[PDB]
Amino acid sequence: ERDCRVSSFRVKENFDKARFSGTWYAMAKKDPEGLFLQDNIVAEFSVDETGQMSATAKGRVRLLNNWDVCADMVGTFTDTEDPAKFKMKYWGVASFLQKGNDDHWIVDTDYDTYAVQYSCRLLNLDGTCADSYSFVFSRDPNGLPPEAQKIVRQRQEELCLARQYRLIVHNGYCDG
Amino acid sequence: ATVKLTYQGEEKQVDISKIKRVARYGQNIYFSYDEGGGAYDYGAVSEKDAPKELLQMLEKQ
Numbered sequence: 001e002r003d004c005r006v007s008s009f010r011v012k013e014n015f016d017k018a019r020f021s022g023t024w025y026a027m028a029k030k031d032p033e034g035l036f037l038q039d040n041i042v043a044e045f046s047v048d049e050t051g052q053m054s055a056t057a058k059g060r061v062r063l064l065n066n067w068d069v070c071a072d073m074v075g076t077f078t079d080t081e082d083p084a085k086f087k088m089k090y091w092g093v094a095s096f097l098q099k100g101n102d103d104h105w106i107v108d109t110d111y112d113t114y115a116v117q118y119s120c121r122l123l124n125l126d127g128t129c130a131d132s133y134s135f136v137f138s139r140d141p142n143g144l145p146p147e148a149q150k151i152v153r154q155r156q157e158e159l160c161l162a163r164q165y166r167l168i169v170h171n172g173y174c175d176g
Numbered sequence: 177a178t179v180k181l182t183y184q185g186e187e188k189q190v191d192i193s194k195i196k197r198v199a200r201y202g203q204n205i206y207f208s209y210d211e212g213g214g215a216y217d218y219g220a221v222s223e224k225d226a227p228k229e230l231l232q233m234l235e236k237q
């Protein structure tokens with residue numbers, strides 16, 4: 001928790017792409033600088049015959065104070081020496097035109113209840129992160145059991161993001 | 177009169193006259209016919225490729 005260099009962060013041991021697959025609901029988020037999905041954020045992870053992992057991400061986007069839309073993005077993950085650290089190329093589909101390439105770290109998960117994700121986009125010279133985003137994912141769209149909640153809080157502190165997350169809803173805006 | 181623009185991911189003939197919502201978002205301009213703002217009812221074009229009549233509508237605010 002006191003060493004805040006991105007290099008010193010533990011990630012998920014022996015991360016298993018296949019057990020991670022399926023639907024993950026974002027329950028809380030820590031925003032990066034700039035534009036970002038707002039809420040109703042749902043990610044679907046998949047593993048193909050090759051073992052290459054993929055995901056879709058859907059959520060609400062606020063174009064104007066009076067104009068909310070939904071946006072879909074697809075991401076393709078390139079493996080690293082670390083089974084939990086990926087490089088994710090992503091792009092919007094249909095008429096969502098945002099795209100990019102981010103580090104994508106699975107900081108921890110039990111695959112059945114919760115996951116903590118993390119992406120440092122820009123590092124300070126001293127190795128701490130100057131621009132990051134992070135999701136708390138749950139298999140349950142509405143909440144986490146208290147056991148999971150305790151672990152998540154620990155991981156947020158380890159990321160030096162304690163108290164920097166916002167809870168985000170799932171109210172059907174993009175899936176009904 | 178109309179312009180070739182992508183709308184809900186499909187190439188459409190868009191009458192810019194009838195656009196009721198327009199916004200700059202990142203490097204792109206998003207637009208919709210719909211006053212009700214249906215969640216997926218929108219198209220988009222890059223700022224650099226945007227027809228001038230669309231930019232005019234955007235900038236008049």
Ligand SMILES: O=C(O)c1ccccc1NC(=O)N1CCC(c2ccccc2C(F)(F)F)CC1
Pocket residue numbers: 035036037043055056057061073074075088090091098099100104
């Ligand atoms: O990145 C931008 O420039 C941007 C601009 C406007 C609006 C949203 C934006 N970006 C995001 O919201 N996100 C969160 C989702 C993330 C993604 C995409 C596809 C598959 C999985 C994931 C995963 F990382 F969440 F798993 C991509 C970055």
Ligand SMILES: [Zn+2]
Pocket residue numbers: 012013
């Ligand atoms: Zn551990």
Ligand SMILES: [Zn+2]
Pocket residue numbers: 140141142143
């Ligand atoms: Zn529940």
Ligand SMILES: [Zn+2]
Pocket residue numbers: 170171172175176
């Ligand atoms: Zn739903």
